[PDB]
Amino acid sequence: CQQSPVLAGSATLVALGALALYVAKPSGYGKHTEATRLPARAAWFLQELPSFAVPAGILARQPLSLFGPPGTVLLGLFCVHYFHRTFVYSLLNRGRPYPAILILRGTAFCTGNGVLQGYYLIYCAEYPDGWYTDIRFSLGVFLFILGMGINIHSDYILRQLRKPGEISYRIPQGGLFTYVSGANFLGEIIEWIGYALATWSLPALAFAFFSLCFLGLRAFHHHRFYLKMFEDYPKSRKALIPFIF
Ligand SMILES: CCCCCCCC/C=C\CCCCCCCC(=O)OC[C@H](O)CO
Numbered sequence: 001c002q003q004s005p006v007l008a009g010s011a012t013l014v015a016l017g018a019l020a021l022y023v024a025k026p027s028g029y030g031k032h033t034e035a036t037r038l039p040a041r042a043a044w045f046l047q048e049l050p051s052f053a054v055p056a057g058i059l060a061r062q063p064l065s066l067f068g069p070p071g072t073v074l075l076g077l078f079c080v081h082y083f084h085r086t087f088v089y090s091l092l093n094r095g096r097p098y099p100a101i102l103i104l105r106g107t108a109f110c111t112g113n114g115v116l117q118g119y120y121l122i123y124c125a126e127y128p129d130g131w132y133t134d135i136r137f138s139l140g141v142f143l144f145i146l147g148m149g150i151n152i153h154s155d156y157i158l159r160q161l162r163k164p165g166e167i168s169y170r171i172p173q174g175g176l177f178t179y180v181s182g183a184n185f186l187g188e189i190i191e192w193i194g195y196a197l198a199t200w201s202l203p204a205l206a207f208a209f210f211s212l213c214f215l216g217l218r219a220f221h222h223h224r225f226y227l228k229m230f231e232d233y234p235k236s237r238k239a240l241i242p243f244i245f
Contacts, residue, residue, distance in 0.1 A: 001123045001124045006116070006120055006124060006202070006203060007202075009112065009115075010116070010202050010203045010206035013113065013203070013206040013207055013209075014206050014209055016109075017209055017213035017214060018213070020210075020213055020217060021213055024217075027102070027214075029098055029099055029102055030096070031222065032221060032225065033096075033099070036099060036100055036101070037097035037099055038098060038103075039097060039098070040093050040094075040095035040097060041090060041091055041092075041095075043090075043098035043103055044086075044093055044098070045090045045091060046103055047090075047106035047110060048085045048089075048106075050107055051085070051086075051110040052079060052082035052083055052086050052114070053114075054111065054115055054118055055079045055082070055117065056079050058119070059072070059075060059076060059079060059118075069127070070125075071199070072121070072122065074121055074195075075117070075118055075122065077141075077144060077195070078117055078118070078195070081148060089155055092159065094164055096167055116207075120201060120203045121199065125199065125201055136197050136198065137198050139194070139197060140194045140195065140196075140197030140198030141194065142194065143193060143194025143197060144191055144194040144195050144198060146190055146194070147188060147190030147193070149187070150176060151184050151186075151187030151188040151190075153175060153183075153187070154172075154175075154176065154183035154184035154186075155184045157172060157173075157174045157183070158172060158184065171226065171230055171234075177237075178237070179237060179238065180237060180242055181222050181226055181238070181239050182215070182220075182222050182239060182240050185215040185218060185219040185240060186219070186240055186241070188211060189208075189211055189212055189215055192212075193208050193212075195208065196208040215240075216240055219239045219240040220240065220245075223240075
């Protein structure tokens with residue numbers, strides 16, 4: 001198990017997070033983005049696919065027994081998330097046309113990240129014997145399914161705000177959106193923090209930190225957008241963290 005490529009992957013993954021904050025301006029593929037584009041369903045399909053296929057391939061070489069290592073089962077949860085993100089979320093996506101340029105970078109991210117998380121958990125990660133009863137797992141797994149529930153529940157609420165083909169932004173109403181503008185982001189952030197907690201691993205903590213930086217900035221700009229574009233937007237709402245930010 002080479003420890004040098006691992007520390008480097010977590011470094012870039014963190015440096016990326018820092019870089020996204022330095023630019024301050026959003027990644028520009030949704031709201032603040034206004035023949036160089038392609039359908040968003042195909043875009044997010046291609047972008048997020050590596051973060052599924054690579055861990056799926058890594059898993060496919062391991063024995064089939066749930067009565068086995070914790071690092072494998074956790075990698076399965078990573079695979080379960082990006083299965084939804086690719087084949088369910090992305091293929092049902094109702095977003096505007098996506099910039100072709102960003103796909104290769106988005107794909108590059110999900111490739112390296114998929115390699116990092118998958119390689120570490122199998123070849124590097126080492127867990128004690130009573131991990132499934134440990135508070136880090138029992139809470140970490142809890143936070144994971146909690147955040148995923150929130151992330152998917154909110155992405156669906158957002159999806160039902162449009163008919164396919166529509167170019168429009170309506171005020172997101174419904175569960176947990178009543179408190180924060182970026183409810184789906186809140187969920188995903190909760191999801192990876194718990195994931196880092198359940199794996200107790202450096203590269204997972206890094207990806208969680210990136211997601212916090214990226215989606216946390218994305219949430220803020222979304223919050224800005226609503227306050228800028230809707231005179232009757234609920235002013236009790238916050239950007240990301242309820243009653244705080
Ligand atoms: C020996 C342990 C010393 C450090 C104790 C820290 C306790 C957790 C405190 C804050 C993190 C909470 C939010 C993030 C969830 C935890 C994931 C994590 O940090 O795991 C990395 C692990 O420590 C790599 O050895």
